[PDB]
Amino acid sequence: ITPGTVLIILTGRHRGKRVVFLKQLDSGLLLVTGPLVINRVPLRRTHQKFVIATSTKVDISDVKIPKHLTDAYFKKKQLRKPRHQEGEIFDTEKEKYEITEQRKADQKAVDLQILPKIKAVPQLQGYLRSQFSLTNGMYPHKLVF
Amino acid sequence: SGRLWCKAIFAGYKRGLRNQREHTALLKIEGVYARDETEFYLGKRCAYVYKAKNNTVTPGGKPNKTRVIWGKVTRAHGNSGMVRAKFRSNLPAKAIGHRIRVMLYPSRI
Amino acid sequence: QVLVLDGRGHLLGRLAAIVAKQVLLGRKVVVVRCEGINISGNFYRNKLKYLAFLRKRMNTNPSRGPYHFRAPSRIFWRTVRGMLPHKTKRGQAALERLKVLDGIPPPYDKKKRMVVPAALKVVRLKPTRKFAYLGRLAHEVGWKYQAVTATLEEKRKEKAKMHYRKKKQILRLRKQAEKNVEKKICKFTEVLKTN
Amino acid sequence: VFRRYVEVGRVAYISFGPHAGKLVAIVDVIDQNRALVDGPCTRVRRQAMPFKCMQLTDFILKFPHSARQKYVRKAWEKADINTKWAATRWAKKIDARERKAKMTDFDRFKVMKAKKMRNRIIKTEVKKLQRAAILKASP
RNA sequence: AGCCUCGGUUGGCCUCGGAUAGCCGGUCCGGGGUCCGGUGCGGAGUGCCCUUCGUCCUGGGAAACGGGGCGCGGCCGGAAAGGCGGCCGCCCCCUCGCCCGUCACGCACCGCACGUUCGUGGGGAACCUGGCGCUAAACCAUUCGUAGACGACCUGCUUC
RNA sequence: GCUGCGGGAUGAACCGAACGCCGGGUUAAGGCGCCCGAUGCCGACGCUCAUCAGACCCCAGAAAAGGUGUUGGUUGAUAUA
Ligand SMILES: [Mg+2]
Ligand SMILES: [Mg+2]
Ligand SMILES: [Mg+2]
Ligand SMILES: [Mg+2]
Ligand SMILES: [Mg+2]
Ligand SMILES: [Mg+2]
Ligand SMILES: [Mg+2]
Ligand SMILES: [Mg+2]
Ligand SMILES: [Mg+2]
Ligand SMILES: [Mg+2]
Ligand SMILES: [Mg+2]
Ligand SMILES: [Mg+2]
Ligand SMILES: [Mg+2]
């Protein structure tokens, strides 16, 4: 797992998507991102033991990652107005989170720099667009990732 | 899309000849027929998935008739690629000859 | 999800052990063309063994006793049942997964047959050793359908010959087309990664 | 029938064992089950290997029986086995198997994507050749 | 629409035959000769469909079969336990369904499991709707005796 | 007898080993074609073909004698006169 490596998101909600790894955070989780134009996955936190690293590499040394995003930037906050039970679902999960102008700003700042490095490879934008899967003919103990 | 786990068959529990040990189960994973090939699957999680008549809650989505018993691979068994496993609860005897999907959640390589 | 195992050339016990071990796992096995299963030893030796087996029978009521089968498919089925734990529910449920059949019926002539090299007579027995054919051995003891079996085998072979001729013509046309379209198809990737 | 023979000066390929995948030169037969092999230029020492362990090839070299290394390596270089070994359909298949085993995920994806372009044109041309043959055999 | 069951997460549509021999290709007179391949590459350590998230604009290669069928006609193609597939003529239409490149979007659920599949799965009781058709047979009672311990079994009834 | 447990299919005395309830590792005796866990080792050398083969202390079967059937050994005698 080196900066610029392709990872497979097996246990996530994406169930086997190929993403690009940027850098390691301070809490021990990997901060990856797939080009939203290629695969609809934003800047996501993943676990080290929960990903498969492919031997492919991408020149990403000039990533210029911001410093404002950290482990505290990726959190799940839940709030409710009433203490007892009611008909509405806490007034929060009914209208799911749609925070913008900050989740899209950094994303548009990073993908406009990542895409010129991915589009240089002859067949990488399709490889990342595709979804990994186990067919009947191959086994992981013999497959080379 | 596509399968994200390896196929394995439940042949029986760890046993001698006149006694059984239900705490440890034996798995015959497809594609592995040698001792030097099962080192990749050591520590991988395993799931025995079946269906019942009463729908139970699922982590994602509405309740479903699906019920799963979790476990993981402990060590190797013999020279023919057979492997061992230990689940949270012992496997029912009706699962002999059925499929336990070996996930790839704990990844080392 | 099925294993269509050919019968000709395989040794009786050497094949039956593999089938009995593979059925207990869950794979549905269908042994086709059981009349060609070879048996090691002299033909007269195997005949004497089968006659000694026939002699064994309950004295007070033979109908309520050992049921001796005359068809080679049923012989192979009994051989596999002797290794499967048929007195338990697991063996009883596994016994339906095995489908022993004489000849190659319509449901199985179109399916490609598998060969287990661990039971082949060529690698199991020396070229100087004597062997006996299960088809002839069964026909000599109370089997009557050897003639019709051979006739239907000849028919299906004459059909498969024409099918293979058509397949070979298709393969020749495919190779000719591959040699024809040299341009517009580089596929250096196929050669660099070796198909 | 029997176009290959073991003899003094037969180069063979090791199918399995500690030196699997290398060529050796049979110096002499010992006890009709194993033979002394040299393989000077293939990076293997002189030792005894079973017949069932090795696989025979087509090339033959001129050695005296029980010859020394300085006399077998000279004849090996005179026959020039190493460079001509790559120019055969057998070492090419072996290297092809090695490459298919060394395939990575990107390589498998590229092969799968190239198959779509390669096989379809072949099929559309076979569909034309078959109809051409039918029209030829029609009268 | 609801209930019971338990199992699978692409399918492989096929020559015979030997193992001191055989495969492919072929001019000639089913066999013979010659030419390639032969630790099998026209190879199941195999090959095709394939690893596809979807929508839209626009360029190169390929494509004249079009591409799916609640559609029609011709053949039953194949009986050992048969029903899917091919060809030709049209039908509502179709040249971004394939490979490479290009501007812009979508449940971006905020690290997590039982996810994706042959499911228009098998079985049983009913509900509202269209088209085409059907209007019985057993057992009991009675009789007969070619049969009967009792059952069972062999037989008759028409208003000429 | 006063004694369970793992192997000998079966079992009073055999071979290991002795016993509180459990989890992990290893092993004794024994075994690894399927019943039944493990040789699915690209195991080594050699013997053996039975129309009554053979397959593990107690243990569940056999002798004197014979074979120009093969496979090794010993003592010897002849043969370019
Ligand atoms: Mg009779
Ligand atoms: Mg007493
Ligand atoms: Mg005492
Ligand atoms: Mg005692
Ligand atoms: Mg005991
Ligand atoms: Mg002692
Ligand atoms: Mg003792
Ligand atoms: Mg213990
Ligand atoms: Mg021991
Ligand atoms: Mg076993
Ligand atoms: Mg005797
Ligand atoms: Mg005994
Ligand atoms: Mg006794």
- Structural method: cryo-EM
**How long, in residues, is chain D?**
139
The answer to whether A34 and A54 have CB atoms below 8 angstroms apart is no
Distance C118 CA to ligand 10 centre (A): 17
β pairing state of C99-100 and C28-32: parallel
Question: Is C170 in CB contact (< 8 Å) with chain D?
Answer: yes
The one-character DSSP state at D6 is: -
Q: Which resolution, in Å, applies to this structure? A: 3.1
Distance C24 CA to ligand 12 centre (A): 29
Residues 75-94 of B with CB under 7 A from strand E: 94
CA distance C17 to chain D (A): 27
Q: Do C25 and B98 touch (CB under 8 A)?
A: no
The answer to whether B46 and B102 have CB atoms below 8 angstroms apart is yes
Q: Do D99 and C180 touch (CB under 8 A)?
A: no
Give me the CA D106–C1' E65 separation in Å, rounded. Answer: 33
The one-character DSSP state at A27 is: S
Give CA–CA dist B68/B58, Å, rounded: 10
What Cα–Cα distance (Å) separates residue B44 from each residue in B10, B85, B100? 16, 9, 12
Instruction: For chain A, report the end-to-end CA distance as a whole number of angstroms.
Output: 12
Give CA–CA dist D66/D29, Å, rounded: 10
The answer to whether B73 and B5 have CB atoms below 8 angstroms apart is no
Give CA–CA dist C38/D7, Å, rounded: 37
Look at residue B42 and give its three-state secondary structure.
Answer: coil
Neighbour-count burial for A56-75, b at 16+ CB within 10 Å, e otherwise: bebebeebeeeeeeeeeeee
The one-character DSSP state at D8 is: T
β-sheet bridge partners, residue B46: B71, B102
Nearest nucleotide to A122, CA against C1' atoms: E100
Q: Where are the beta strands (DSSP E) in C53-108?
A: 99-100
**Which among A139, A143, A145 is the top mutation candidate for probing chain D, defined by the most D β-carbons within 10 Å of its own β-carbon?**
A143
Q: Is the CB of C109 under 7 A from strand E?
A: yes
Q: What is the CA radius of gyration of chain A?
A: 18
Q: Do D118 and C177 touch (CB under 8 A)?
A: no
